[PDB]
Design an enzyme around this catalytic site. Structure first.
Site, PDB file in Angstrom:
ATOM      1  N   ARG A  39     -12.572 -19.518  12.252  1.00 34.63           N
ATOM      2  CA  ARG A  39     -12.012 -20.688  12.939  1.00 34.63           C
ATOM      3  C   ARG A  39     -12.265 -21.967  12.152  1.00 34.63           C
ATOM      4  NH1 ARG A  39     -13.894 -23.724  18.097  1.00 34.63           N
ATOM      5  NH2 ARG A  39     -11.929 -24.552  18.954  1.00 34.63           N
ATOM      6  N   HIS A  43      -9.437 -24.676  11.135  1.00 41.08           N
ATOM      7  CA  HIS A  43      -9.564 -26.107  11.430  1.00 41.08           C
ATOM      8  C   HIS A  43      -9.620 -26.935  10.178  1.00 41.08           C
ATOM      9  CE1 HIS A  43     -10.744 -25.897  15.914  1.00 41.08           C
ATOM     10  NE2 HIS A  43      -9.715 -25.132  15.597  1.00 41.08           N
ATOM     11  N   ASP A  44     -10.045 -26.352   9.064  1.00 40.89           N
ATOM     12  CA  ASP A  44     -10.020 -27.082   7.816  1.00 40.89           C
ATOM     13  C   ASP A  44      -8.537 -27.230   7.413  1.00 40.89           C
ATOM     14  OD1 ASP A  44     -10.480 -28.347   5.495  1.00 40.89           O
ATOM     15  OD2 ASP A  44     -11.133 -26.597   4.384  1.00 40.89           O
ATOM     16  N   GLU A  65     -14.711 -35.056  11.512  1.00 36.14           N
ATOM     17  CA  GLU A  65     -13.804 -34.270  12.300  1.00 36.14           C
ATOM     18  C   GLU A  65     -14.569 -33.447  13.299  1.00 36.14           C
ATOM     19  OE1 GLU A  65     -11.272 -31.981   9.728  1.00 36.14           O
ATOM     20  OE2 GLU A  65     -11.067 -33.702   8.375  1.00 36.14           O
ATOM     21  N   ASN A  71     -12.996 -29.634  17.990  1.00 32.17           N
ATOM     22  CA  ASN A  71     -14.202 -29.248  17.274  1.00 32.17           C
ATOM     23  C   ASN A  71     -15.493 -29.529  18.006  1.00 32.17           C
ATOM     24  OD1 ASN A  71     -13.203 -28.252  14.780  1.00 32.17           O
ATOM     25  ND2 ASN A  71     -12.738 -30.329  14.159  1.00 32.17           N
ATOM     26  N   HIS A 171      -7.705 -14.361  17.551  1.00 34.50           N
ATOM     27  CA  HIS A 171      -8.298 -14.189  18.864  1.00 34.50           C
ATOM     28  C   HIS A 171      -8.567 -12.713  19.192  1.00 34.50           C
ATOM     29  CE1 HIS A 171      -6.804 -18.489  19.903  1.00 34.50           C
ATOM     30  NE2 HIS A 171      -7.862 -18.567  19.068  1.00 34.50           N
ATOM     31  N   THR A 172      -8.513 -11.847  18.171  1.00 32.67           N
ATOM     32  CA  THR A 172      -8.934 -10.468  18.379  1.00 32.67           C
ATOM     33  C   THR A 172     -10.479 -10.420  18.419  1.00 32.67           C
ATOM     34  OG1 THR A 172      -8.691  -8.193  17.616  1.00 32.67           O
ATOM     35  CG2 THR A 172      -8.998  -9.852  15.924  1.00 32.67           C
ATOM     36  N   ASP A 231      -9.093  -6.387  14.860  1.00 34.74           N
ATOM     37  CA  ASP A 231      -8.102  -5.327  14.960  1.00 34.74           C
ATOM     38  C   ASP A 231      -6.888  -5.846  15.727  1.00 34.74           C
ATOM     39  OD1 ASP A 231     -10.053  -3.522  17.521  1.00 34.74           O
ATOM     40  OD2 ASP A 231      -9.035  -5.481  17.602  1.00 34.74           O
TER      41      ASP A 231
HETATM   42  C1  HEM Z   1      -2.340 -20.903  17.998  1.00 32.72           C
HETATM   43  C2  HEM Z   1      -3.172 -21.937  18.461  1.00 32.72           C
HETATM   44  C3  HEM Z   1      -4.538 -21.845  18.772  1.00 32.72           C
HETATM   45  C4  HEM Z   1      -5.155 -22.395  19.814  1.00 32.72           C
HETATM   46  C5  HEM Z   1      -4.606 -23.270  20.906  1.00 32.72           C
HETATM   47  C6  HEM Z   1      -6.551 -22.005  19.763  1.00 32.72           C
HETATM   48  C7  HEM Z   1      -7.544 -22.336  20.685  1.00 32.72           C
HETATM   49  C8  HEM Z   1      -8.894 -21.941  20.622  1.00 32.72           C
HETATM   50  C9  HEM Z   1      -9.807 -22.243  21.650  1.00 32.72           C
HETATM   51  C10 HEM Z   1      -9.575 -23.006  22.957  1.00 32.72           C
HETATM   52  C11 HEM Z   1     -10.929 -21.634  21.270  1.00 32.72           C
HETATM   53  C12 HEM Z   1     -12.249 -21.555  22.039  1.00 32.72           C
HETATM   54  C13 HEM Z   1     -13.126 -22.767  21.644  1.00 32.72           C
HETATM   55  C14 HEM Z   1     -14.428 -22.837  22.454  1.00 32.72           C
HETATM   56  O1  HEM Z   1     -14.542 -22.245  23.522  1.00 32.72           O
HETATM   57  O2  HEM Z   1     -15.366 -23.523  22.040  1.00 32.72           O
HETATM   58  C15 HEM Z   1     -10.717 -20.907  20.069  1.00 32.72           C
HETATM   59  C16 HEM Z   1     -11.613 -20.137  19.391  1.00 32.72           C
HETATM   60  C17 HEM Z   1     -11.346 -19.371  18.224  1.00 32.72           C
HETATM   61  N1  HEM Z   1     -10.124 -19.432  17.501  1.00 32.72           N
HETATM   62 FE1  HEM Z   1      -8.415 -20.188  18.172  1.00 32.72          FE
HETATM   63  N2  HEM Z   1      -6.787 -21.257  18.618  1.00 32.72           N
HETATM   64  C18 HEM Z   1      -5.540 -21.243  17.974  1.00 32.72           C
HETATM   65  C19 HEM Z   1      -5.320 -20.635  16.698  1.00 32.72           C
HETATM   66  C20 HEM Z   1      -6.235 -19.949  15.937  1.00 32.72           C
HETATM   67  C21 HEM Z   1      -6.093 -19.500  14.636  1.00 32.72           C
HETATM   68  C22 HEM Z   1      -4.842 -19.837  13.886  1.00 32.72           C
HETATM   69  C23 HEM Z   1      -7.267 -18.908  14.248  1.00 32.72           C
HETATM   70  C24 HEM Z   1      -7.649 -18.358  12.982  1.00 32.72           C
HETATM   71  C25 HEM Z   1      -6.796 -17.594  12.242  1.00 32.72           C
HETATM   72  C26 HEM Z   1      -8.138 -19.044  15.355  1.00 32.72           C
HETATM   73  C27 HEM Z   1      -9.393 -18.431  15.397  1.00 32.72           C
HETATM   74  C28 HEM Z   1     -10.303 -18.570  16.476  1.00 32.72           C
HETATM   75  C29 HEM Z   1     -11.544 -17.869  16.619  1.00 32.72           C
HETATM   76  C30 HEM Z   1     -11.942 -16.730  15.678  1.00 32.72           C
HETATM   77  C31 HEM Z   1     -12.165 -18.372  17.668  1.00 32.72           C
HETATM   78  C32 HEM Z   1     -13.567 -17.980  18.136  1.00 32.72           C
HETATM   79  C33 HEM Z   1     -14.598 -18.881  17.493  1.00 32.72           C
HETATM   80  C34 HEM Z   1     -16.038 -18.608  17.916  1.00 32.72           C
HETATM   81  O3  HEM Z   1     -16.295 -17.715  18.747  1.00 32.72           O
HETATM   82  O4  HEM Z   1     -16.908 -19.361  17.468  1.00 32.72           O
HETATM   83  N3  HEM Z   1      -7.527 -19.691  16.371  1.00 32.72           N
HETATM   84  N4  HEM Z   1      -9.416 -21.133  19.662  1.00 32.72           N
HETATM   85 CA   LIG Z   2      -9.061 -30.154   6.046  1.00 37.73          CA
HETATM   86 CA   LIG Z   3     -10.589  -7.067  18.728  1.00 37.99          CA
END
Ligand code: HEM
Ligand SMILES: [Ca+2]
Ligand SMILES: [Ca+2]
Ligand code: NA
Length: 306
Positions: A39, A43-44, A65, A71, A171-172, A231
């Site tokens: 993530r 975000h970068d 940021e 963030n 989000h897998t 996955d």
């Molecule tokens: C399509 C739009 C997206 C939205 C609206 C979104 C939204 C979020 C939100 C709300 C969280 C939870 C943050 C928290 O509870 O503190 C999250 C976590 C995360 N996002 Fe997404 N996300 C998006 C796209 C992506 C993309 C493009 C990736 C990477 C390829 C990504 C990877 C992750 C991961 C792996 C987590 C878990 C991080 C952790 O557990 O520390 N997200 N995202």
């Molecule tokens: Ca950047």
């Molecule tokens: Ca999974």
């Protein structure tokens, strides 16, 4: 200068191994770190490109940021990136940019969690400033509609629905705070009812994890099937109306999903199809407005400009 996977093959041939070792070690005590690191790279890249701008701490002339809505109290793993950066600096002084370090960390994280393995293009350099306002403007929200998610990706240079559907596959694994799904569970779009696109059985489970007036910071798994394994189960969940956040489910349920539905189905149907699309989308995301050549610098401490 075009990014190339062999950029450090002479100057720091074991950079990927150092990054991997750092993550393997951290995963033992923090099973969430591979998700967190992926993530951080997203975000970068979504804010001025993959230039490590997100790693910069606050200064009196620009805000970090890290205080962006997407963030603050959310992004994590910064000390782990510092640890791997120090290890790489020891092995190959002033060679590997924080922007590239973070890209490799994200790929290694995905592979360590069971995902595809590939060599990312390299040669990015580090920003000379951070972009808080741009991060507030560019990072998408979990409450975004599908046209808003599409707009957010296009705004940073990813025009393809496959980019959005494949990268949402991040989000897998990983965690999400109750805060971001409360509307879906109890009052969606001021309708006074749960989001109808959330499977009713799962709705009950989620309401038990995130009761009304409960701890909004409690963490829930993005993927109810394999919470920590990279996955394609994320897409199988969407097909069953089990995407966790609104932006997840929108890929399959939105009135504007004529183009994303077939991608969701294709990725649910084949791990290879998903993995190929994820690598392709990751590399496109990793190619967003990099500083290269002599632009920017190889930052010594990722938190501060040299
Ligand atoms: C399509 C739009 C997206 C939205 C609206 C979104 C939204 C979020 C939100 C709300 C969280 C939870 C943050 C928290 O509870 O503190 C999250 C976590 C995360 N996002 Fe997404 N996300 C998006 C796209 C992506 C993309 C493009 C990736 C990477 C390829 C990504 C990877 C992750 C991961 C792996 C987590 C878990 C991080 C952790 O557990 O520390 N997200 N995202
Ligand atoms: Ca950047
Ligand atoms: Ca999974
Ligand atoms: Na591009």
């Amino acid at each position: 200068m075009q990014l190339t996977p062999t950029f450090y093959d002479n100057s720091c041939p074991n950079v990927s191994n150092i990054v991997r070792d750092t993550i393997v070690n951290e995963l033992r005590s923090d099973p969430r770190i591979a998700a967190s690191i992926l993530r951080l790279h997203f975000h970068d890249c979504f804010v001025n490109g993959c230039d490590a701008s997100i790693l910069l701490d606050n200064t009196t002339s620009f805000r970090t940021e890290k205080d962006a809505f997407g963030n603050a109290n959310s992004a994590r793993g910064f000390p782990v990136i510092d640890r791997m950066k120090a290890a790489v600096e020891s092995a190959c002084p002033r060679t590997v940019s924080c922007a590239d370090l973070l890209t490799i960390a994200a790929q290694q994280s995905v592979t360590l969690a069971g995902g595809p393995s590939w060599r990312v293009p390299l040669g990015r350099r580090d920003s000379l400033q951070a972009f808080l306002d741009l991060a507030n403007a560019n990072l998408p929200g979990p409450f975004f509609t599908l046209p808003q998610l599409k707009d957010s990706f296009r705004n940073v240079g990813l025009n393809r629905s496959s980019d959005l559907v494949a990268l949402s596959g991040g989000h897998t694994f990983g965690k999400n705070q109750c805060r971001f799904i409360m509307d879906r569970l109890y009052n969606f779009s001021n309708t006074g009812l749960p989001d109808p696109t959330l499977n009713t059985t799962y709705l009950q489970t989620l309401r038990g994890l995130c009761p009304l007036n409960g701890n909004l910071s409690a963490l829930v798994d993005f993927d109810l099937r394999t919470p920590t394994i990279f996955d394609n189960k994320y897409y199988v969940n969407l097909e069953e109306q089990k995407g966790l956040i609104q932006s997840d489910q929108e890929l399959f349920s939105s009135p504007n999903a004529t183009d994303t539905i077939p991608l969701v189905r294709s990725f649910a149907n084949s791990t290879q199809t998903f993995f190929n699309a994820f690598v392709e989308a990751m590399d496109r995301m990793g190619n967003i407005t990099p500083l290269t050549g002599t632009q920017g610098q190889i930052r010594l401490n990722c938190r501060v400009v040299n």
